[PDB]
């Protein structure tokens, strides 16, 4: 058995405040003897609009460097290793700007106990949706990724990584299992409407489809994305402020048979951590008994 | 603006004549309820005791199908009203199969129109070869030969129909292909086990519905099956010890909208045959696809 921690939190537009929360969760995870901690999409910030995101993305590299230092500090202080999977934003590179692509990068970092970034997964499927009872277009601020993420040989086993919308495209999850995934993660900032309808369904489905443990770290609650300093500098009227967002939470861990084995406590309000012990022998037993990957029709599909 | 579907739940025996009677009653009920199409489960002609039994019964299936074709035209004529029928049956191996040393039966999903014309015979692609958790070892491939073709989209009275069977549901790329080809409605006629049914039946149907943004129809076998066949047991020189033929199906037949909402579901208080009805809404389906345009947002540059 190996221990995973899944974090649930509520990002503001203040990267400093968000970093403090992130650090506390990582510290809690080490104290609870988790070997890896998984944090949601956009753990560095959430923004009011594309202009705001571009402004905040400039601050993200410092957030990441301070986080790297904080992990090595926490590991050394507690005398125990932990790896961190965390959703952040990155600003466009110098080359991107020259090519006329001034969009930010929605990225999932895997940072090991040495504070080294082992992977930077850039979100492949962008959330451009008329949410059933606001009209969202992530591609107005965000640039899509160019590559399928490699499987990570984590302390928990073979890990396949994805972000939010990615979960809705089953071919991605299937590919990660084909590449050797035993564990999938979907750090997310889900809406209330789609969360109530599909969050648990999609997580359990991916787990059952792929015979993988599935980790679902989610943003939760009502966000306050106000940023007086940005609002002043860009000369905003209060009428064009868009600082309210709300996220579904219900962060969970699902076993390869679709059983929810850990779930966020709905009665606790702030950031929270959930723990699960993962069983490699149960995973192997499920795959042995129902050998889906020996039964696919690759000749046709 | 709405189109009515009927989904049948039944309990097949090894007796093709008895099974036909039940199928005929359900189709009759569907026409009376003004369903445009009726969907029946996998193995609606028969279920068997073992691979040898299946091969023996499959020889009787062509007669079953001809009688069914005739029954449909008779029912259409007598009610002055059209219906199409989707039904899981078995078929014996072809001469070409036999020449290749393949005497296994075909697990096929038939689409039959109101004139009794067979429009499609989809031969099941993925076969149920699994060790059931706290259950029996099952190997469909011992009795059944896997298909070699992706089923064409059927332009049914309800809309564009993508067809699959049972175990096919567990392979998301199949349902994804059906939607890519233009499906608006998916069907998974099944004979699902108790153990896997309790765990995954509702999950898989709802998942496929929301994955593909299609209506999903799930006609299921239900109950403890009577696989008794005295004349065949005699012919096979089967002892009473070998005669213990136990099989049980999950049922819980349902219809699911493209958002994953269950809109019709079998009554759990019946273990016998029953029909459920649903009105399918084309506007809702198109609305969902418009608001979340998944098929405009895939990464074919990476997956394929
Ligand atoms: C019994 As036939 C040859 O119409 O499938
Ligand atoms: C043919 As006998 C009744 O001896 O098994």
């Amino acid at each position: 058995l190996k221990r995973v921690a899944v974090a649930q939190l509520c990002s503001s537009a203040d990267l400093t405040k968000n970093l403090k929360v992130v650090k506390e969760l990582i510290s809690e995870a080490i104290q609870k003897k988790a070997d890896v901690v998984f944090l949601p999409e956009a753990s560095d910030y959430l923004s009011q609009n594309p202009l705001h995101s571009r402004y905040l993305a400039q601050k993200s590299p410092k957030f990441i460097r301070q986080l790297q230092s904080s992990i090595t500090d926490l590991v050394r202080d507690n005398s125990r290793n932990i790896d961190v999977s965390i959703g952040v934003h990155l600003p466009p590179s110098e080359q991107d700007l020259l090519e006329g692509n001034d969009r930010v990068r929605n990225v999932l970092l895997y940072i090991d106990h040495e504070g080294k970034i082992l992977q930077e997964y850039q979100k492949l499927h962008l959330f451009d949706v008329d949410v059933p009872n606001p009209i969202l277009k992530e591609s107005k601020s965000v640039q899509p990724g160019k590559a399928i993420p490699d499987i990570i040989e984590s302390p928990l086993g073979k890990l396949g990584s994805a972000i939010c919308y990615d979960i809705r495209f089953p071919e991605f999850s299937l590919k990660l299992r084909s590449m050797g995934a035993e564990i999938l993660c979907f750090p997310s900032a889900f809406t209330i409407k789609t969360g109530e309808a599909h969050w648990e369904l999609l997580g359990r489905a991916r787990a059952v489809d792929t015979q993988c443990y599935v980790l679902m770290p989610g943003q939760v609650g009502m966000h306050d994305l106000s940023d007086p300093e940005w609002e002043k500098q860009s000369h905003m009227s209060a009428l064009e402020k868009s600082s309210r967002r709300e996220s579904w939470g219900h962060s969970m861990v699902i076993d390869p048979w679709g059983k929810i084995i850990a779930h966020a406590d709905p009665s606790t309000v702030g950031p929270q951590l959930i723990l699960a012990d993962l069983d490699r022998e149960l995973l192997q037993e499920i795959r042995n008994k129902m050998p889906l990957w020996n039964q696919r029709r690759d000749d046709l599909f």
Side-chain angles (χ1 to χ4, degrees), chain A residues 1-30 32 34-50 52-75 77-93 96-115 117-130 132 134 136-139 141-145 147-192 194-195 197-231 234-240 242-279 281-283 285-288 290-301:
Chain A
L1 294 168
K2 286 169 195 172
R3 190 166 289 182
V4 62
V6 165
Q8 174 160 115
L9 48 67
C10 184
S11 294
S12 69
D14 192 332
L15 280 82
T16 306
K17 286 191 180 186
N18 293 336
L19 185 55
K20 185 176 176 291
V21 173
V22 162
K23 283 156 76 176
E24 288 176 329
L25 289 158
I26 296 170
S27 178
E28 188 186 337
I30 304 166
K32 290 176 175 179
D35 304 315
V36 190
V37 57
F38 289 80
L39 297 107
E41 183 184 19
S43 290
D44 60 339
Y45 71 82
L46 281 163
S47 68
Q48 290 182 222
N49 59 218
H52 199 203
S53 188
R54 291 183 175 92
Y55 167 86
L56 292 170
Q58 290 300 306
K59 305 179 180 292
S60 292
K62 178 175 181 163
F63 176 102
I64 294 152
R65 289 188 297 266
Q66 293 185 310
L67 182 57
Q68 284 176 106
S69 297
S70 296
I71 294 156
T72 66
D73 282 352
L74 286 169
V75 164
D77 190 54
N78 285 277
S79 281
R80 203 183 197 272
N81 294 330
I82 202 168
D83 288 4
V84 179
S85 175
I86 182 171
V88 297
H89 297 83
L90 286 171
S93 64
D96 292 343
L97 294 188
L98 295 172
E99 295 171 321
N101 183 33
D102 63 346
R103 289 180 293 164
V104 309
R105 272 130 50 61
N106 190 334
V107 182
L108 182 61
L109 304 180
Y110 190 99
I111 313 167
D112 73 7
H113 57 94
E114 292 182 341
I117 303 178
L118 302 190
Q119 180 168 275
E120 294 193 8
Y121 165 67
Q122 195 177 327
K123 195 175 181 184
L124 293 178
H125 306 91
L126 299 192
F127 191 56
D128 290 4
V129 170
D130 181 325
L136 287 162
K137 191 173 171 178
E138 192 182 13
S139 65
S141 54
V142 177
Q143 43 165 111
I148 301 165
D150 292 335
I151 298 303
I152 298 172
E153 318 272 5
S154 82
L156 305 164
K158 294 187 170 188
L159 171 70
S161 294
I163 301 164
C164 207
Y165 209 41
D166 287 337
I167 203 176
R168 288 196 181 268
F169 303 81
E171 65 267 41
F172 187 11
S173 286
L174 298 173
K175 179 60 173 182
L176 294 174
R177 168 64 198 281
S178 295
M179 293 162 61
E182 296 163 335
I183 300 154
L184 303 170
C185 68
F186 302 98
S188 299
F190 250 67
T191 72
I192 299 300
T194 59
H198 303 149
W199 173 256
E200 182 173 305
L201 182 59
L202 294 156
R204 290 184 63 214
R206 299 297 86 94
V208 174
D209 291 346
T210 64
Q211 308 175 124
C212 283
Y213 279 96
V214 168
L215 318 173
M216 309 188 74
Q219 297 277 343
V220 70
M222 183 190 76
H223 309 263
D224 181 359
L225 307 182
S226 67
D227 188 341
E229 292 310 311
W230 173 73
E231 287 157 26
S234 62
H235 306 285
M236 309 222 317
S237 77
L239 266 68
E240 59 211 346
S242 182
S243 57
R244 185 205 176 86
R245 191 175 171 154
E246 47 192 309
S247 296
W248 179 244
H250 296 73
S251 298
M252 73 182 82
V253 177
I254 304 159
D255 86 3
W257 190 250
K259 175 176 187 194
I260 303 167
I261 62 164
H263 193 102
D265 179 354
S267 72
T268 134
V269 163
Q272 68 174 288
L273 209 65
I274 63 162
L275 306 171
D277 292 321
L278 313 183
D279 193 341
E281 268 149 51
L282 171 75
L283 182 138
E285 182 202 284
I286 289 163
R287 293 177 180 193
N288 281 162
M290 195 186 293
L292 300 172
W293 262 256
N294 290 342
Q295 294 168 343
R296 317 206 85 76
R297 298 297 303 269
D298 297 339
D299 60 316
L300 297 166
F301 302 106

